[PDB]
Amino acid sequence: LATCYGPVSADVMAKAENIRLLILDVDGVLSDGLIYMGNNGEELKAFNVRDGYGIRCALTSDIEVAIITGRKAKLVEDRCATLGITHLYQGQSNKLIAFSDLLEKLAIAPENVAYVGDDLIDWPVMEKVGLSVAVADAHPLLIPRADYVTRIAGGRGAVREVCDLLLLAQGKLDEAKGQSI
Amino acid sequence: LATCYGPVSADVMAKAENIRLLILDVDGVLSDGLIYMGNNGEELKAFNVRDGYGIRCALTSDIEVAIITGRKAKLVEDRCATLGITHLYQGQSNKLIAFSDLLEKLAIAPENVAYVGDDLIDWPVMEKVGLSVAVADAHPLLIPRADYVTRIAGGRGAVREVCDLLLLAQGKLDEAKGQSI
Amino acid sequence: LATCYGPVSADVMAKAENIRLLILDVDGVLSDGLIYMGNNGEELKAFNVRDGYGIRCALTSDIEVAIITGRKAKLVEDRCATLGITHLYQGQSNKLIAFSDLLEKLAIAPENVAYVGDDLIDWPVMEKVGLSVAVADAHPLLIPRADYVTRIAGGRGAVREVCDLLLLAQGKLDEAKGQSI
Amino acid sequence: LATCYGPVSADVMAKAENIRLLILDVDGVLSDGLIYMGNNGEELKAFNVRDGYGIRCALTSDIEVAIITGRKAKLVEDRCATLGITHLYQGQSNKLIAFSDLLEKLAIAPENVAYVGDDLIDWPVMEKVGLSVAVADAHPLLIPRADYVTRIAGGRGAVREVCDLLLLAQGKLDEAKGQSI
Ligand SMILES: [Cl-]
Ligand SMILES: [Cl-]
Ligand SMILES: [Cl-]
Ligand SMILES: [Mg+2]
Ligand SMILES: [Mg+2]
Ligand SMILES: [Mg+2]
Ligand SMILES: [Mg+2]
């Protein structure tokens, strides 16, 4: 079937139909992959507004959104609040331990879960999910392993593409309402 | 029909001939859609100096400039003040309201209004205005709907491109004076 | 003759031999064209490190560097302070007034001056210098007016390219010394 | 000879096998070369998180990591502290002096040392090491001097590429554990 980013396989479209939960990586997926650091200890990161719209569409379209992260950075919390993301696991050695608790807390099967990644630490979780996604400019070794590879880059609208995919496959796209924030 | 950005249709030029008001979204139009967020609630947005020049030219050549955006930040007011933009609406995802307020306060028919946007949230207003513009890298679903697609990406001089177009259509480009600020 | 950016005309090379002073624009030449603003009135601009190396070379090679800019900004002052740029003109409406005052203060003729600009306000001065330069991604209407059009974009090493050219033209590139700061 | 970024020469792979120390430049190598400066003395620099993971991998796989940079900023110390780089030299433009101190302190030969650079100031050291690396978007004059030129630009994963290269040559890539931070 066709999408506004180009055609996708029937298999990928079938996986996208069943997703109840979308897990997102922060750095290199939601952001341009950079961490901005100051002399007085400031730490800034950038998120894509059009990604936000996709995320808010997904949340109003009965798709839950979650984030798994290595270190408890306050900005990610603030960003989650802005978009209304209540599921934020921070300070995570494994992404597997956080992944298991998410499935317990929501009683959702692994095949009903999508994950978007960009580096090799993202894989162990992507191996077990229903739809595994790698961003266009993800690490060369992650790309061939994922079920789907986005056309758009990390922090440039790749998350929007996946949201857009999940909506289309589930036939909620035309009616989906979000905020570009 | 000739512009410094490439050929444009007689229809778009005839539409641009009549613009008394230029409405702009911020994120993905006046910026590349990025939001920088810090660990102490620091927010940063990036604006384009040549977009500024074009806005200055537009305002000194009897064309009003307005802004309607979904987010709300002090920095946006500051940029507005720097450029002499007196009409701004923030924290608004139903953009039809702010738009209707503008049609009242400036006594201006909707077909004398140009609107530049990048996401689907912008379209409700774009459908009603005289000249609707989508930026080169606007969300793929917006692009086919617009009257004119800019050559230049949001945050890189798409606004400048749009200001350039109106001024040329009104015979004002040659003389127009601005400050690249 | 040939350079590390591609061949250049005999004329452009001949003009570069005589350059004793290189005037630079800040926005869109030394910067990515962007101005980063914040909620507590913060303002940040980005400068390229390899531009630093070039400016340092030029200054130790009997080529003065000057900047004409429309505002006062401490960040610019600090940038000039880092690279040893003493001649900084701040708050200039016209650039011609600053250009005359620069010419009289240094006892240097118009043909020994080079200017690197990116927008239509740089032209009134660019017209009067020996070597005028528009950066790769300058406003489309400025590009055909310049003597030389850089291969590298504004804020990416365009200034380095112009330093690299001046130096080579004067037989100083091989022996030049700078710091990538 | 096959990597995930593409084929490298047999000589480069033999060189990479013997690397026991990796020396990095910061500006233009670990970053895209931009320096963010503000009105209050705020300074920012962007590092690449996937670069971090490579460095973390190199450090945990018996390959020491060191930094010599022309600039001086507390922010760099923060970065090295996060990644675990104990060997750091700032405000050092004659980079040979730090290079001398490094070999002396680690009791290690130059032919076991690898250097990634982006500008000419990086060459006097690069000339002496066993594996010299220019980034994809290094200065045109540095590119042909290096043993190897990365496929990825500085600050987009050029350092990660080199980390992947050493690890592969030393058979340590598959098992290498790091953190994308
Ligand atoms: Cl919006
Ligand atoms: Cl200017
Ligand atoms: Cl350096
Ligand atoms: Mg990541
Ligand atoms: Mg928008
Ligand atoms: Mg300028
Ligand atoms: Mg450097």
Swiss-Prot record, chains A, B, C, D:
InterPro entries per record: CMP-NeuNAc_synthase (IPR050793), HAD-like_sf (IPR036412), HAD_sf (IPR023214), KdsC_fam (IPR010023)
Cofactors, names only: Mg(2+)
Function according to Swiss-Prot or TrEMBL: Catalyzes the hydrolysis of 3-deoxy-D-manno-octulosonate 8-phosphate (KDO 8-P) to 3-deoxy-D-manno-octulosonate (KDO) and inorganic phosphate.
Residues the entry annotates as binding Mg(2+): D25, D27, D118
CDD domains xrefs: HAD_KDO-like
GO biological process per UniProt: lipopolysaccharide biosynthetic process
The species this protein was found in: Escherichia coli O6:H1 (strain CFT073 / ATCC 700928 / UPEC)
Matching Pfam families: Hydrolase_3 (PF08282)
Enzyme Commission no: 3.1.3.45
The name this protein goes by in its record: 3-deoxy-D-manno-octulosonate 8-phosphate phosphatase KdsC
Family, as annotated: Belongs to the KdsC family.
Binding site for substrate: D27, N48, V49, R50, D51, G52, R56, R71, R79, K95
One GO MF term: 3-deoxy-manno-octulosonate-8-phosphatase activity
Enzyme class: hydrolase
Catalytic activity entry: 3-deoxy-alpha-D-manno-2-octulosonate-8-phosphate + H2O = 3-deoxy-alpha-D-manno-oct-2-ulosonate + phosphate
Keyword annotations from UniProtKB, A to Z: Hydrolase, Lipopolysaccharide biosynthesis, Magnesium, Metal-binding
Assembly information from the UniProt record: Homotetramer.
Gene3D superfamilies in UniProt: HAD superfamily/HAD-like (3.40.50.1000)
Pathway this chain belongs to: Carbohydrate biosynthesis; 3-deoxy-D-manno-octulosonate biosynthesis; 3-deoxy-D-manno-octulosonate from D-ribulose 5-phosphate: step 3/3; Bacterial outer membrane biogenesis; lipopolysaccharide biosynthesis
